[PDB]
Design an enzyme around this catalytic site. Structure first.
Site, PDB file in Angstrom:
ATOM      1  N   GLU D   3       0.957  -1.336  -0.070  1.00  0.00           N
ATOM      2  CA  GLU D   3      -0.145  -0.035   0.042  1.00  0.00           C
ATOM      3  C   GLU D   3       0.755   1.206   0.154  1.00  0.00           C
ATOM      4  OE1 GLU D   3      -3.749   0.695   1.290  1.00  0.00           O
ATOM      5  OE2 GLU D   3      -3.999  -1.016   2.844  1.00  0.00           O
ATOM      6  N   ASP D   4       1.339   1.760  -1.217  1.00  0.00           N
ATOM      7  CA  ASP D   4       2.222   2.812  -1.240  1.00  0.00           C
ATOM      8  C   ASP D   4       3.367   2.831  -0.109  1.00  0.00           C
ATOM      9  OD1 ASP D   4       0.810   4.556  -3.389  1.00  0.00           O
ATOM     10  OD2 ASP D   4      -0.822   5.014  -2.118  1.00  0.00           O
ATOM     11  N   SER D   5       4.397   2.170  -0.388  1.00  0.00           N
ATOM     12  CA  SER D   5       5.496   1.829   0.529  1.00  0.00           C
ATOM     13  C   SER D   5       6.212   1.158   0.102  1.00  0.00           C
ATOM     14  CB  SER D   5       5.041   1.981   1.928  1.00  0.00           C
ATOM     15  OG  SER D   5       4.581   0.575   1.969  1.00  0.00           O
TER      16      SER D   5
END
Ligand SMILES: [Zn+2]
Ligand SMILES: [Zn+2]
Ligand SMILES: [Zn+2]
Lengths: 46, 65, 266, 134, 33
Positions: D3-5
């Site tokens: 998720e975005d990382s």
């Protein structure tokens, strides 16, 4: 053999103290830096 | 701003090939892609390491005290 | 001879193309990992800055230096600074270098790693020599400078391994591969019309016989033969990086058997 | 990496990947009062007032400033300054409570009204750490 | 003939020494080209 301030362009170990104004021996430019410190400093190799 | 020592990705050394590389151009008048393979940079990870880098340093030096 | 044999293919001063056979994947890799981040080597691990008038800032250079590959074939006989009872580095656990440069030439002065000067007692043992493979003979441009740009340094090499910081590892990249003609189906090739054509064929295919359609699926098959190629930075001859690897590992598996004993007494 | 990382290979982080420099820079002047009363750049200590800072002045020279090489950190002082009030009240300037690093360049200059003007520049190096954004 | 205030000039404009100056010329001024 000992120093203080510096010409920002015509870099020439100057040095001075209270009330001695803040110019340079010729090159007016009242800027002046302050050159490193003798005491060595350590750094990490990473 | 000074070539990097070794390629972040894989690690092989690199910082020496600078002048060697920058030379096979001006003097041996070659095309980048070929110069590199000639300097031993086989994979893009390292390959890219050189090909990209910008020697800003040179422009820094041009300053003064 | 007995078990895991070898058939080195191409092989030089910096590379070791070899066909390691009859072993277990596990092991094959284990070794790989070891060769990568657990083989001890030496490198500058401290910098006392006396004087720097360059554009690059202290730590910047500091950092660079660390990376500078250093000699270390005789590293196995130079205790880890955290053991050399000496309070903070003995000649018995660390080399010491120096770097001094001045803007004499009215035209850009290159400061390479060759300019590194060993100051402590080597005690006669290949160690702490800035490795060089350059054609001209001045490997690793550490920094440049103009007019009266000065630089005075104090480098303190030490042991340490990649695990503890990459600047150490003597690996630099290791090829690894097997089952080139995916026979164990350890992979499902992604395609568009026909994997075969779309998915390039590795050179290693020749050293193992192709498929042969009709034949069912071989399920008992496991993995022998691993096409590896160990490159080296130079701080150790390629070969050792392979050996010293096979060792450090060997040594580790021991510390366990060893520890189990130091525990059987009570 | 969810998720975005992302997962960033540390090894390369060490080989120099994404390292950044960061310069900040404090600044002060010797305020003046027509009726002749001037502040000053000295290294004071007790002597009546008591109103100083917790910081360690011990890193200052005698002109009231620090010098390049130095390695500042917590709330250490960076500039010594005193105001004569009717006589030792501090006007010194600490390094921002949360930072830390190395002084990098200082400079004293005159300010039109003929006042002492200083600009301290403390540089630090930041390395791609976990919480960091990319 | 008479002094009447100061007009904050804009860099690189016509009145900024930078307009006419050249590469090298600049560096000596510390102004990044
Ligand atoms: Zn001057
Ligand atoms: Zn690479
Ligand atoms: Zn010791």
């Amino acid at each position: 053999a000992t120093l203080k301030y510096i010409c920002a362009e015509c870099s020439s170990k100057l040095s001075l103290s209270r009330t001695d104004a803040v110019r340079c021996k010729d090159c007016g430019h009242r800027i002046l830096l302050k050159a490193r410190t003798k005491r060595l400093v350590q750094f990490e190799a990473r | 701003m000074i070539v990097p020592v070794r390629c972040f990705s894989c690690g092989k050394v690199v910082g020496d090939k600078w002048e060697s590389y920058l030379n096979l151009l001006q003097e041996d008048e070659l095309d980048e892609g070929t110069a590199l393979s000639r300097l031993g940079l086989k994979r893009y990870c390292c390959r890219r390491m050189i090909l990209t880098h910008v020697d800003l340093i040179e422009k820094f030096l041009r300053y003064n005290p | 001879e007995e078990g895991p044999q070898v058939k080195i293919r191409e092989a030089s001063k910096d590379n070791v193309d070899f066909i390691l056979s009859n072993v277990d994947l596990a092991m094959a890799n284990s070794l790989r990992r070891v060769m990568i981040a657990e083989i001890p080597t030496l490198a500058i691990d401290s910098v006392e800055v006396e004087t720097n008038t360059t554009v690059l800032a202290d730590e910047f250079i500091a950092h660079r230096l660390g990376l500078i590959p250093l000699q270390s074939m005789d590293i196995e006989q130079l205790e880890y600074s955290r053991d050399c009872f000496c309070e903070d580095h003995c000649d018995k656990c660390s080399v010491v270098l120096t770097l001094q440069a001045f803007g004499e030439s009215e035209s850009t002065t290159n400061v390479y790693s060759k300019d590194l000067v060993i100051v402590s007692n080597l005690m006669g043992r290949n160690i702490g020599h800035p490795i060089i493979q350059d054609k001209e003979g001045n490997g690793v441009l550490i920094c440049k400078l103009r007019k009266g740009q000065e630089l005075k340094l104090t480098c303190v090499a030490k042991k340490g391994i990649a695990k503890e910081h990459a600047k150490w590892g003597p690996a630099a990249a290791i090829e690894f591969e097997y089952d080139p003609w995916n026979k164990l189906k350890h992979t499902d090739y992604w395609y568009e019309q026909d994997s075969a054509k779309e998915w390039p064929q590795s050179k290693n295919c020749e050293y193992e016989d192709p498929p042969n359609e009709g034949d069912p699926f071989d399920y008992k098959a496991q993995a022998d033969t691993f096409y590896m190629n160990v490159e080296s930075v130079g701080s150790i001859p390629v070969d050792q990086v392979v050996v010293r690897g096979i060792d450090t590992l060997q040594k580790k598996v021991a510390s366990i058997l060893l520890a189990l004993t130091q525990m059987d007494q009570d | 990496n969810q998720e975005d990382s992302m997962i960033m290979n540390q090894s390369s982080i060490d080989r120099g990947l994404f390292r950044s420099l960061f310069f900040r820079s404090y600044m002060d002047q010797e305020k003046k009062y027509g009726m002749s009363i001037t502040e000053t750049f000295e290294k004071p200590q007790r002597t009546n007032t008591l109103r100083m800072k917790h910081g360690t002045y011990d890193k200052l020279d005698d002109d009231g400033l620090i010098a390049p090489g130095v390695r500042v950190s917590g709330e250490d002082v960076i500039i010594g300054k005193t105001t004569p009030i009717s006589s030792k009240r501090d006007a010194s300037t600490p390094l921002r409570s949360t930072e830390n690093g190395i002084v990098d360049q200082v400079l004293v200059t005159t300010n039109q009204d003929g006042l002492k003007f200083v600009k301290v520049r403390v540089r630090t190096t930041k390395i791609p750490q976990i919480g960091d954004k990319f | 003939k008479v002094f009447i205030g100061r007009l904050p000039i804009m860099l690189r404009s016509k009145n900024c020494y930078l307009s006419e100056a050249t590469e090298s010329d600049l560096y000596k001024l510390k102004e990044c080209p």
